[PDB]
Design a protein around this ligand. Structure first.
Ligand code: MG
Lengths: 380, 362, 181
RNA sequence: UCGACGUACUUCAUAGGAUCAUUUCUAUAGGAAUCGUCACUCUUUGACUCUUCAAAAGAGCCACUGAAUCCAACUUGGUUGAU
RNA sequence: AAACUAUGCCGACUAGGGAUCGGGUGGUGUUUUUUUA
RNA sequence: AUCUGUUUGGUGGAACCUGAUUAGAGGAAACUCAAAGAGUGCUAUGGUAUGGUGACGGAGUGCGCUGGUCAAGAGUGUAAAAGCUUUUUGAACAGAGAGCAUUUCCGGCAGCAGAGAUUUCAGCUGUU
């Protein structure tokens, strides 16, 4: 049987434990009896992943118990013999057998990866790559795996070359997931901020790339969203097709707004320049729908970001009157082209923005600018 | 599938030789994946190169038929092709070396005026060639020198030669004295082994690609398989419908034997009768593996010998063995009587009996 | 045993855990069932008597055919066996071998003769009535179901006077006379 | 009454092929079987209890201690309706 | 006087085994024997 | 109807004959106990069994191996070419974990500071 072969592989380890004096023969017998039940459990029918989890948990405690008797009895940190790595080798083997038997369980894969990453010295990083290669092939459509190895090789390794290739391959399999685009762009700018800081660090001691990802993201996400909500067929009625166009604009708009929030985090990059690219993107008519005509509510938000763009990142201390005038000059420009209902709502939002960010944070009696802000707010 | 890819009426006379080759023209790479080529020679004094469409791969989607013809002054009797290079050799009144891209023999090899009956290129030291003559001789050649090397004259003609796929310097010979002889290239005075089970002339011989077994076709309507380390067959294959075994071959997996007789049928046989072609579960594999070692350990027991060696051979072969056994006993009894009184009658080993002489003495 | 596979059957041709050659085909059990013999060794006690008859006949046959001694003894044996009821016919001397069998002797047992006289519906029923003391032969009650009845004594097989079975016979035909009982 | 002749009448052969029979092999290579079990469904047979056709015999007598049924009696429901 | 219980497929046809009769060749060592033949 | 007596359906099953069976033929109950047959279900998966006996593993180096680009050589072809084959060689590039050696370092001990939830890992300095 398979069990007898695996039990006999434990014998050289147990001969070592008795020989070193850490475990008595009676104690060694008790460990084998417990191991015998597990190995029979794994090699039989009806086995579940919990059996593998239980056996791995048991082996870990045996490793701990041997470790403490090693310091208590032998009084040595490491006894150069088979007993040291026999348990660790075994636990890895249980992980391999369980993963092959039950590839569907993603939790077990995570435990396997955490276990092998934890003992970095014992396990070469090359072995970690093999686990990810086999896992990725089985589940190409789980983005969390793709980001995990990308994150692992950006933090533990910091190989942007391999990490970039992971995002390149991951998006190839899952172009319809906004989440993977969000992380790849986050990685892309993360590579830039780290790079510029190195240049800044270099000086003392002596963004478009993300936008392209954003642009292709918005096109690709649109195509798949249209394919979904249509089923096997196209939609014959014209009105329904218009609605499907409206949904993707809103769905794509929410994605674009989510990227807008991401840019704010990055002080080093020229966020105003990066945001303006997004605003320019939405100016172009898309899917035969105009934002100003068909989706005004999205348009007002599009206008509002443009109005505050020059003053969005200006602290109250460095508030320049001329730049505020440019914002107000932009404010009057859009009103001349907007309807009354839109102007009122747009007026309310802009007034609240100025009041909350600048007026409420400024002392009234110390700064002449406070009077100017109130006059503008009153006139707005 | 046991079906034909193509059938060609290649020659007006008898097809005296055939080999499957992978040509390399100087200027053109033939599509080896989609086409396979075979060379045929006949007593009408011509050698023809053919092309056959095959369905090994589906990477494509013709030119199926005769490609090139070589004319010769005399009839041909045996053909074989060099494995590494494109050169191939034909054996007729003179053994000729040909190149696929030349219409005439590039080089002429011959020990003398005697004709050559067969030839077979070496499989590992691909530059070496061996041939069989009608004067009961075996001539060894080397293309690196473009000359013959060694010659030994035996008591009877040898019909076929095969080289050991795993031992570059060893080859077995099918002989007309009811025997097959295993020879070492470097020392041809003595044979390595002799296989004696057949009762008629052995007409063809072939090595298993593992190199640990040989199969011999005989004029007695039987096929016998020998272990290279033993001088007696472990098996005999026969059928009432098989009429004269003239060719025997091993499948490249060593699992099957292909035999061609003069009744016009090409049969397939298992190398080991009791084995089966299905993939075995681990429990099956170990039990069968366990049995084989268990059989080898007790092979010397009387009862196990009785059953293991028992085969039903045709009546004609059985009577031949009985008459053959009586004759050898009389000869052995008789030489024993002569040795009692004869002062000088030497002992000659069975391995050295068949050699009449060698050209280059050492 | 489970049904043997093909390769097992060829290697275990003679294996049989329920039939052996020494059983002689379970002839004893078959004859015991037919006539409801309750003692396991009754058949083989009968078999020895049959063999004694057959042995004597074989020796008699080897005497010369015209011998007065041979003819006398062979007729005497035929005379005696017919009287017991073992042999149905006296004509043929070969009957001493061919038609002398344990079934012939068992067929003269009291339960079987009751069945043939229709005193019981089955041999098993006849055995029960004998064990229950309903059957007499002549004036003697017999509770032994192995009693052999000769041809002459088959006339005296009958029910006991006070048997409840007799009352049912007479009551069914409305011919019961309680003076007798 | 037996013979001979004549007439009439009854009976008698033989083949081809395959399979099963040797604890492998019935003589043929033209053919098909070598695995240490865990469950579920169905089907056949046999036991144990009881029982019909359908009866028959009770290892037998006393004492104590439990149980079941059917009446009597009592208690509940019941013509504003039991069965 | 004689026969009187037998019998074997046949042939243009292969390779043999043991024993024996006549001749011849070779080997060997026991009988044999020696310049009378 | 102290009319008539055929048919249909139920009840009953003498005699003869034919067939099958025979320690007579049956029936009811089950989270009962046995002996067998057939089918079905289940990753039912070592083609030669974990990366590892300090007999070791990790890091590095070199060799080995892979992919195509370029250059050169050889063959073929031509007026000269272009073109095609190459188990001919070299360069740089991009690599796989998939082999071989390598003591060059680490994995004993103390201290510095960090990442993660008293425990795990990573870096540096002294020491055997
Ligand atoms: Mg017949």
């Amino acid at each position: 049987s398979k069990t007898r072969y695996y039990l006999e592989q434990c014998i050289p380890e147990m001969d070592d434990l008795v020989e070193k004096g850490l475990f008595t023969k009676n104690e060694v017998s008790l460990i084998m009896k417990k191991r015998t039940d597990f190995e029979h459990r794994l090699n039989s029918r009806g086995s579940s992943i919990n059996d593998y989890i239980k056996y791995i948990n048991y082996e870990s405690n045996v490793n701990k118990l041997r470790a403490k008797r090693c310091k208590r009895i032998l009084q040595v940190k490491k006894t150069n013999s088979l007993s040291d790595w026999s348990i660790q080798q075994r636990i890895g083997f249980i992980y391999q057998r369980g993963t092959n038997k039950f590839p569907q369980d993603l939790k077990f894969w995570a435990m396997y990866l955490n276990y092998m990453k934890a003992r970095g010295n014992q396990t070469s990083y090359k072995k970690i790559h093999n686990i990810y290669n086999q896992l990725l092939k089985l589940h190409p459509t789980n983005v969390d795996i793709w980001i995990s190895c990308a994150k692992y090789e950006y933090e533990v390794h910091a190989n942007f070359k391999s990490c970039r290739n992971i995002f390149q391959n991951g998006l190839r399999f899952n172009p319809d997931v906004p989440k993977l685009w969000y992380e790849y762009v986050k990685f892309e700018l993360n590579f830039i901020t780290k790079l510029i800081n190195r240049r800044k660090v270099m000086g003392l001691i002596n963004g478009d790339i993300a936008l392209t990802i954003f642009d292709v993201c918005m096109k690709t996400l649109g195509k798949h969203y249209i394919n979904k909500h249509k089923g096997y067929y196209a939609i014959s009625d014209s009105k329904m097709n218009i609605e499907l166009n409206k949904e993707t604009l809103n769905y794509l708009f929410s994605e674009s707004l989510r990227y807008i929030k991401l840019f704010d985090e990055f002080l080093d990059l020229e966020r105003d320049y990066l945001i303006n690219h997004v605003l320019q993107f939405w100016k172009n008519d898309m899917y035969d729908l105009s934002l100003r005509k068909d989706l005004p509510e999205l348009y007002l938000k599009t206008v509002m970001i443009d109005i505050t763009l020059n003053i969005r990142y200006m602290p109250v201390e460095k508030l320049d009157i001329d730049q505020l005038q440019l914002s107000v000059k932009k404010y009057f420009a859009y009103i001349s082209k907007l309807d009354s209902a839109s102007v009122k709502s747009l007026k309310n939002e802009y007034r609240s923005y100025l009041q909350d960010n600048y007026l409420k944070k400024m002392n009234a009696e110390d700064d002449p600018r406070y009077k100017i802000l109130d006059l503008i707010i009153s006139k707005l | 599938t046991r079906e034909e890819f193509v059938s060609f009426k290649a020659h007006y006379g008898l097809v005296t030789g055939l080999c499957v080759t992978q040509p390399r023209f100087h200027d053109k790479k033939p599509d080896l994946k989609s086409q396979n080529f075979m060379l045929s020679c006949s007593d009408d004094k011509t050698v023809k190169l053919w092309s056959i469409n095959v369905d090994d791969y589906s990477n494509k989607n013709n030119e199926e038929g005769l490609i090139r013809t070589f004319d010769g002054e005399s009839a041909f009797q045996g053909i074989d092709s060099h494995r590494e290079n494109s050169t191939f050799a034909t054996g007729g009144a003179k053994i000729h070396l040909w190149d696929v891209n030349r219409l005439k023999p590039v080089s002429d090899l011959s020990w003398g005026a005697d004709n050559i009956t067969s030839l077979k290129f070496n499989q590992n030291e691909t530059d070496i060639l061996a041939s069989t003559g009608s004067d009961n001789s075996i001539v060894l050649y080397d293309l690196r020198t473009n000359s013959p090397t060694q010659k030994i004259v035996q008591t009877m003609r040898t019909n076929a030669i095969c080289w050991n796929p795993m031992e570059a310097f060893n080859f077995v010979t099918a002989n007309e004295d009811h025997n097959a002889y295993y020879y070492d290239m470097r020392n041809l005075s003595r044979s390595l082994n002799v296989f004696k089970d057949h009762v008629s002339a052995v007409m063809d011989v072939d090595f298993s690609p593992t190199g640990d077994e040989i199969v011999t076709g005989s004029y007695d309507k039987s096929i016998r398989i020998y272990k290279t380390n033993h001088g007696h067959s472990r098996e005999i294959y026969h059928t009432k419908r098989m009429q004269h075994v003239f060719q025997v071959k091993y499948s490249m997996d060593s699992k099957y034997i292909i035999s061609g007789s003069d009744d016009g049928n090409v049969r397939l046989w298992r190398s080991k009768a009791w084995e089966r072609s299905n993939v075995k579960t681990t429990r099956e594999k170990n039990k069968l593996e366990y049995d084989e070692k268990l059989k080898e350990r007790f092979r010397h027991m009387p009862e196990i010998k009785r059953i293991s060696r028992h085969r039903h051979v045709p009546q004609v072969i059985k009577k031949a063995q009985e008459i053959k056994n009586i004759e050898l006993s009389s000869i052995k009894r008789r030489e024993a009587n002569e040795r009692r009184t004869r002062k000088d009658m030497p002992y000659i080993s069975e391995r050295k009996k068949q050699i009449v002489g060698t050209v280059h003495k050492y | 045993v489970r049904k043997l596979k093909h390769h097992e059957q060829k290697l275990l041709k003679k294996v049989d855990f329920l039939e052996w050659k020494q059983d002689q085909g379970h002839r004893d059990t078959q004859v015991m069932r037919t006539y409801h013999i309750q003692n396991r060794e009754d058949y083989h006690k009968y078999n020895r008597i049959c063999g004694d008859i057959r042995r004597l006949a074989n020796k008699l046959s080897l005497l010369p055919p015209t011998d007065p001694f041979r003819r006398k003894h062979e007729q005497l044996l035929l005379d005696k066996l017919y009287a017991m009821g073992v042999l149905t016919t006296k004509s043929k001397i070969s009957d001493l071998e061919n038609k002398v069998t344990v079934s012939a002797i068992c067929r003269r047992r009291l339960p079987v003769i009751m069945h043939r006289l229709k005193m019981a519906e089955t041999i098993q029923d006849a055995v029960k009535f004998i064990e229950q003391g309903h059957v007499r032969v002549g004036p003697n009650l017999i509770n032994d179901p192995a009693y052999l009845v000769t041809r002459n004594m088959e006339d005296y097989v009958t029910w006991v006077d006070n048997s409840k079975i007799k009352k049912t016979l007479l009551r069914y035909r409305n011919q019961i006379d309680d003076f007798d009982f």
